[PDB]
Motif scaffolding. Structure first.
Motif, PDB file in Angstrom:
ATOM      1  N   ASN C 326     114.615  89.514   8.293  1.00 43.00           N
ATOM      2  CA  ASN C 326     114.227  90.805   7.663  1.00 43.00           C
ATOM      3  C   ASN C 326     113.438  91.545   9.039  1.00 43.00           C
ATOM      4  O   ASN C 326     112.248  91.405   8.896  1.00 43.00           O
ATOM      5  CB  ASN C 326     113.295  90.850   6.620  1.00 43.00           C
ATOM      6  N   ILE C 327     114.149  92.115   9.895  1.00 41.99           N
ATOM      7  CA  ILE C 327     113.641  92.586  11.166  1.00 41.99           C
ATOM      8  C   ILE C 327     112.657  93.628  11.207  1.00 41.99           C
ATOM      9  O   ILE C 327     112.239  94.129  12.145  1.00 41.99           O
ATOM     10  CB  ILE C 327     114.676  92.657  12.278  1.00 41.99           C
ATOM     11  N   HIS C 328     112.508  94.116   9.885  1.00 47.46           N
ATOM     12  CA  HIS C 328     111.494  95.311   9.791  1.00 47.46           C
ATOM     13  C   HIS C 328     110.508  95.104   8.845  1.00 47.46           C
ATOM     14  O   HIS C 328     110.180  95.975   7.984  1.00 47.46           O
ATOM     15  CB  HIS C 328     112.281  96.720   9.229  1.00 47.46           C
ATOM     16  N   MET C 345     101.334 105.854  23.493  1.00 47.65           N
ATOM     17  CA  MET C 345     102.180 106.973  24.025  1.00 47.65           C
ATOM     18  C   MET C 345     101.570 107.595  25.231  1.00 47.65           C
ATOM     19  O   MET C 345     101.895 108.911  25.222  1.00 47.65           O
ATOM     20  CB  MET C 345     102.255 108.076  22.946  1.00 47.65           C
ATOM     21  N   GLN C 346     100.974 106.920  26.308  1.00 42.18           N
ATOM     22  CA  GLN C 346     100.754 107.270  27.523  1.00 42.18           C
ATOM     23  C   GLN C 346      99.700 108.661  27.350  1.00 42.18           C
ATOM     24  O   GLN C 346      99.489 109.508  28.131  1.00 42.18           O
ATOM     25  CB  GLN C 346     101.963 107.956  28.384  1.00 42.18           C
ATOM     26  N   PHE C 459      91.308 113.640  17.360  1.00 38.13           N
ATOM     27  CA  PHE C 459      91.382 114.171  18.468  1.00 38.13           C
ATOM     28  C   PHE C 459      91.359 113.572  19.639  1.00 38.13           C
ATOM     29  O   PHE C 459      91.436 113.948  20.922  1.00 38.13           O
ATOM     30  CB  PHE C 459      90.601 115.512  18.470  1.00 38.13           C
TER      31      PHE C 459
END
Ligand code: G1P
Ligand code: GLC
Ligand code: NA
Ligand code: NA
Lengths: 479, 479, 479
Positions: C326-328, C345-346, C459
C-alpha cells in the motif's frame, strides 16, 4: 436584439494571415452557418495575444483596417473585446503618465498602490494572483521618481482605476467608437478584476461589481450594443449577470460535458440545463482553455477531480490561481491547457455529441475556430512561443483550413451549425425531456417547428429529428 | 481426459518464426516439463491477434500446415481456440451473405439488428459491449442494400446467431475438424456474448448461457474433447462452469497472488484455495494481461486498489472498462497491461514462489511462454505496433529462447515444471495446511506419494518436500 | 562534554575531493559558525556508502590519513561512526573465519544461524528487517564447508554476536583507537539490531538493549567520549536513550516542521517542544531520507499523510518498509528520498524558519552539508550509481561551495549558525512561550543573556530578538 445564430470565435491573423483572409474563409464555408463573429483583440497590443491594447480606436495594420471589420457587419453580428480592466503601458494615456508624473491629466486613470498605505499580510492573502508576482509594478518616471501601480496580468497591462472618473470616460469613448463600426456585443474582458478594495478579495467585490456592471450596460445600450461580461468563478455570478439584462458565459457547460461524456452520466448535466441562466452565450472551447471554477456546484468536487485527472495525460501544465504566496504556492487548477477535441480523446462521435448538446442549450452558441476544425494540441507552437495557452491557438493557413474543413467530423459539425443557425424552432422555447441517467433529450418548439436531440452518452450517439414545415413530416438530420 | 501436467501457452510465430520452430523449441527444452500446449489462434484471421478466423479448418500458411499441428498431438495435449461468438467478415459464410443477401443459405447464421425493432435507451445501456460503439455494424450488400449485423468486437468480427440453428452446425463442424486433428481441449473464446436478448445485458445471460455450454460440451465429448470456457467476470460464473463438467479458468489467482506476494498476506489466498472451483485451468499470466473483475469478491476492493496502485508504475496504460472516467478506481480497470514477471518487480524468489503456489493449486496449470522465459515488458514492441497488449507478447528467436532458458530463474521454474508434470502426488487429493496470515502451506497426497509446499510471503521463499517412493525417504526439491 | 554549538554533517570526499579540502572549506566559511563535525564513515569500506568498515583503525587512503582527521580536533568536536552491529566481510577478523573455519579464534565474533536450531515461521516473520530476504548469508569456507551467518544489511555487512565476548572487545578496541585520535562523540550506527533472540523482533529487544547500551557508553566515557545511538523507530526509544546519559536523535523534528510549515500548524510542534527529550542531537536533513516512523505519535496519522502527499511530487521514490504493498499509506513509507530544501519547495523564508526552530530546540543542532548549501534534488547523481539516497548526497567542488555560500538564503542560514554557536543564552534553560496555533514562540535565557524567536507559520516569517550584552539593549538579529 442579436441573431440567434452560431458565432465564430477567431483571431484576426490565425486563419490565413490577416482579416481579409478571415472574411474570405467565412464566405466560402460559413456563409449560411454563422450569424456573428467574435473577433479576438485586433487592436495595437504589446502583450498577451491582443489583450494589452494601446487604444481600442485603431486596428493593427498587420491585421488590416477598420474597413476590413465593417465588411463583416453587413451580414453578421460583431462581438469585440473591451478590456475594461486594463490598457497598455505604451498607450497614449499611460505614456503621458510617465512624462508628466502625477501632474498628468491621466493620473487618476490608473490604480496607485500608495493610496492604500501599508497592506497587511492578511489582506494580501485575500487577493488571488494570475502570474507568479504580486499585482504591483514599479515604474520609473521621466523625472527619476519610482512609484508602483496595480498590475494584475503581465507588466505591460496597467489596470484602470474605477474609483476615479477618467476610467469611465475612457471606456465610454471606446464604446461609442466601437459601436459606430458595427459592434453588437461588447465582451467585457476580465470584468471581475475592476473592483479593488483593500480588505476584500479585490475580485468581484459586491456590490461595487454591480454598479460598474449596470453602468457599462447602460452605456452600451445608447450605442446599440449588449454586453458579455467575462467572469471565471462560481456559476452564481453568471446568474447575477443574467438577471441584469446582460449575457453571461455558459462556462459551466464545457467541463460539465467533458465529465458527462467521459463517464456516461447525464444527472448533473440535466440538472444544470433545467436551471441554467438564460440569455447566455454558450461555449465549449475558448481561446483560454477549459476553466474549472466555473463548474463548482454544477459538478460535485469529487467528480471535478475525476475530470481533472482524466484530462491530465492529454493536457499540458495547467494555468493556476495563487495568493500572497505566489512563487511555489501550487494553487487551484484554474484552466486545463487542452483543445476541447483532445479533451474528448479525439472521439468524433463524442465531439459531435457535445456540440449538439451545446447548440440545444438555451443561449447563443459560440464555436471556437480550432474546435470548428477539430484541431489537436499544438505541441510545436507552444514550445516555440512559450505561451502555455497557445496549445489551443492553432495557426491555420487558407490551405490548412480547406483541408481540415473536409474532415468527416468537420462536415458533421457544419451540418449542425447550418441547422442551428437556420431552423426556426430554436427561436421558440426550450423544453427538456425525461431521460435515464446516461442520456439527454433536448427539444425546441416554435409553433409547428420542432426539433429534438437525443444523445446516448454510453455510445456517443447523436440523433436529431426535426419537422419539415413545407411537408409536415418528421425527418432525420443527417450528421 | 487430459494429462494432469503443466501446459504451455504460446503463439504460433513468436517462438522462432512458425509452428515448426515452436515444436523444435519444445522438444529441446520442455519435452518432460509439459504435457500439453495451448496454441493461440493459428487460423486465417484478419483482426485482433488471430481471434477473427475465416475458418477453423485451415492453418495460416505463414505459420505452417496441419501436419505441423499434428506433430504436437502424439506426445502432448492440444488446446485450441474455438471462437464461438464470432467469425470473420472475410469468412466464406459471411462473404456469401454480402453477395446473395437474405437469399443466402448462410443468412440466419448472423444476428440482424432490425429483428429487435426499436431498442429503448435503457435496454441499450444494459448491454455489456466495452467499446464506445453500439455493437452494430452497418454492411453494404452487393446489390447496394445497407443492413446492420451484431458486432461485439472489431468490425471484422461478425457475431453468430444462437437463436437459429446454422450457428450450432458451424460450431459442430469446426469441433469435428479440430478434434480430428488431435485437439483435446477447446478453449471457448468469449462464449459469454453468445447470448443476445434485448432487455438483458447480452452477456452471460442465465440460464440460456448454460444451455449453449451444455450443448457444446456434449458435442465436444462425442468427438473426444473437453471445454475451457473463457469468461472474465465474477468468480461465481467460474463455479457454474465447474459444476457443468467443464474447465473454468483460475483467473482469480493471478491478482490474488500478486497482492499476496506484494503484501505478505495469505488470508484471502488461503480462503480462495479452500473453496476454489474444481477442474479449473490455473494461470498466472495469459496473452491478455492481469484481469481485475475476476478477483472482485475474492479480494476486498481496498486491497485490489492497493494492487492496482502498486502495479501502475511498472505497467503500461491499463485496458479500461466502458465510460470509466475514474481511471484509478477498481471499477475502471479491466486488465493491467504488464508481464507477470515485471508485476513482481522482477524478483526471482517471488516469481518462483508464485509458480509453486500455482502448481499446487488444484487444476491443470498453464504457463505462458513469456512467463516461462522470465520476460520483461516489451516497451519497444508495444510502441512499434500500437497494440497495448503486445507489452506481454514478446518475440523470441530460437537463439533468444536458448539464452533465456539458461537464466537461473528459468532453470528454477523448469525444475518446478518437471516436478509438477511428473511427480504422482498431484494425481491424488489436495490438502491445504494450516499457516499464519503471512504464509501458505500446500500439499498433495496420492498413496505413498506426498509433496508439500511452504512459501513464506515475507521473504518469498519456496520450499518443497517430496517422498521418493523407490527409497521411502523425504527429499527437498532443489529449485 | 561537548561544545553547545552547531555541528556539520558531511562526507569526507563530497566537499572538494578529500579530507584536506574539507578542512580548507570549513576554515574558509564555517570556522566560527560550527563547534564540531560529524564526518560520515571514512574507513575502508566495500558497501553502503561507507558503513561496511574492514576496521575502524584505518582511514581509506582515497580520503586521506589520520593526520587529516586530527587537523579538525583541538578546534572542533568530532563525531564518528561506530558500526556496532556489523563489520565488513573483507575485514581481517572475518577473513580469518573463512580461512580456518570454526578453528578461528574469531569464530565466536559472529552469529551462526544453525546455533538457533529450527526457527518457526512465526519467529522469522517477527524479525524487524526491511528487506525481502532472510537476514541469513550462506558463505563458502576455504575448506569447502557451507555455513550461514546473520546478515541484516547488504551481504558485505556481517553482523556481530553480542552473546559472546569477542564482539565487546572489538568495539572496545575500536573505541579506544577512535578516542585516541580526538573523537568526542561516537555515533552508534544501527545499534537496534545488536540484540538477537529468536521469538523476538531482533530489534531494540528490552531490556537486553540497555544492557548493551549502558556498556558502550561507559567504555566511551572511560576514553573521554559521549555516545549518539541512532535508532529509527517510535520516539519512546529516544527518551529511553536520553535517560541513560546518551544523546538521542531528534528524528521527530524534521517531518514535524515540514508538516508545521506546509500546513501552518504549531499545535503538534509546541506539544513536542514542551516535552521533547533533551540532551538530544537535533537534525533537519541527514545523509539518509526523511524518516517517517520517527514521528508516529508525535504527529497524527492523518497529518503525516498530508505531509507525504505534499512531498510526493518533490521527492524521488521513497524507501519502503517490508512487504508494504500500500504505497500511499503512512505505515508503508520508511524514509522520504528528498533534500530538505526541496521538501520546503525552495522557499527561502520557510527553510530559514525551520533552521531557526531547530536551533532553539533543546539539544545540539547538526546541519547537513546539502542543507548548509541549500542544495536541490540531484537527479543526475541519483540516476547514475543507482543509489536512491544519492538524491540527498550532492557532490560539491570547492568552487561550487564558495558559490553557494553567496546565495542569499545561505547567508541568512550562516548568520543563524554563528548566532546559535556563539550567543551564550543557549547554554541556559529553555522556556517555551505562548502563541496561537499557527505560530511558534521560543526563547532561551542564561543569566543576563536572552534571545527570542517568533515564527509565523502562515507567512514563514522569522524574527529573533536578543539582548546584546555589549550594550544591554534588545536588538533584532538580521537574517
Ligand atoms: O479567461 P481568463 O483566464 O479569466 O482571462 C482572460 O483575460 C486576460 C486579460 O489579459 C488574458 O490573460 C486572457 O484574455 C484571458 O486569460
Ligand atoms: O475477441 C476475443 C476476445 O478474447 C480474446 O481472448 C482476446 O483477449 C481478444 O481477442 C478479445 O478480447
Ligand atoms: Na461516452
Ligand atoms: Na514479499
Amino acid at each position: 436584439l442579436l441573431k440567434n445564430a452560431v458565432q465564430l470565435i477567431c483571431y484576426p491573423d490565425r486563419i490565413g494571415n490577416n482579416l481579409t483572409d478571415l472574411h474570405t474563409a467565412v464566405e466560402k464555408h460559413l456563409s449560411d452557418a454563422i450569424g456573428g463573429l467574435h473577433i479576438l483583440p485586433f487592436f495595437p497590443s504589446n502583450a498577451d495575444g491582443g489583450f494589452s491594447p494601446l487604444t481600442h480606436k485603431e486596428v493593427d495594420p498587420a491585421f488590416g483596417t477598420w474597413d476590413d471589420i465593417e465588411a463583416f457587419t453587413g451580414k453578421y453580428d460583431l462581438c469585440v473585446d473591451l478590456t475594461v480592466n486594463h490598457i497598455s503601458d505604451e498607450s497614449p494615456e499611460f505614456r503621458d503618465f510617465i512624462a508628466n508624473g502625477f501632474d498628468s491629466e491621466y493620473a487618476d486613470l490608473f490604480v496607485h498602490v500608495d493610496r492604500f498605505g501599508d497592506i497587511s499580510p492578511d489582506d494580501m492573502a485575500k487577493i488571488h494572483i494570475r502570474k507568479e508576482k504580486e499585482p504591483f509594478r514599479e515604474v520609473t518616471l521621466a523625472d527619476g521618481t519610482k512609484t508602483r501601480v496595480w498590475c494584475t496580468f503581465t507588466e505591460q497591462q496597467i489596470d484602470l482605476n474605477y474609483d476615479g472618473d477618467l476610467a469611465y470616460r475612457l471606456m465610454e469613448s471606446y464604446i461609442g467608437f466601437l459601436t459606430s463600426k458595427g459592434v453588437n456585443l461588447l465582451r467585457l474582458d476580465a470584468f471581475g478584476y475592476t473592483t479593488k478594495r483593500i480588505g476584500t478579495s479585490c475580485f468581484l467585490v459586491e456590490p461595487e461589481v454591480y454598479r460598474i456592471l449596470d453602468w457599462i450596460n447602460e452605456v452600451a445600450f445608447k450605442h446599440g450594443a449588449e454586453c458579455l461580461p467575462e467572469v471565471h468563478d462560481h456559476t452564481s455570478y453568471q446568474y447575477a449577470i443574467s438577471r441584469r439584462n446582460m449575457h453571461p458565459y455558459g462556462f459551466a457547460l464545457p467541463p460539465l460535458l467533458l465529465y458527462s461524456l467521459l463517464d456516461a452520466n447525464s444527472v448533473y448535466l440535466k440538472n444544470w440545463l433545467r436551471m441554467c441562466p438564460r440569455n447566455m452565450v454558450t461555449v465549449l472551447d475558448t481561446h483560454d482553455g477549459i476553466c474549472i471554477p466555473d463548474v463548482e456546484g454544477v459538478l460535485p468536487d469529487d467528480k471535478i477531480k475525476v475530470l481533472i485527472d482524466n484530462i491530465d495525460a492529454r493536457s499540458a501544465d495547467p494555468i493556476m490561481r495563487r495568493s500572497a504566496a505566489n512563487i511555489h504556492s501550487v494553487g487551484a487548477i484554474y484552466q486545463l491547457t487542452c483543445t476541447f477535441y483532445d479533451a474528448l480523446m479525439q472521439n468524433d462521435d463524442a465531439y459531435i455529441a457535445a456540440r449538439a448538446i451545446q447548440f440545444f442549450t438555451p443561449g447563443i452558441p459560440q464555436v471556437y475556430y480550432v474546435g470548428l476544425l477539430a484541431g489537436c494540441n499544438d505541441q510545436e507552437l507552444m514550445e516555440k512561443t512559450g505561451e502555455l495557452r497557445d496549445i489551443n491557438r492553432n495557426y491555420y493557413t487558407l490551405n490548412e483550413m480547406d483541408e481540415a474543413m473536409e474532415k468527416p467530423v468537420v462536415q458533421r459539425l457544419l451540418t449542425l451549425m447550418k441547422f442551428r443557425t437556420n431552423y426556426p424552432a430554436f427561436d421558440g422555447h426550450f423544453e427538456l425531456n425525461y431521460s435515464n441517467d446516461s442520456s439527454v433529450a433536448m427539444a425546441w418548439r416554435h409553433g409547428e417547428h420542432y426539433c429534438h436531440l437525443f444523445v446516448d452518452l454510453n455510445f456517443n450517439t447523436s440523433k436529431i429529428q426535426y419537422v419539415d414545415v413545407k411537408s409536415g413530416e418528421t425527418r432525420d438530420l443527417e450528421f
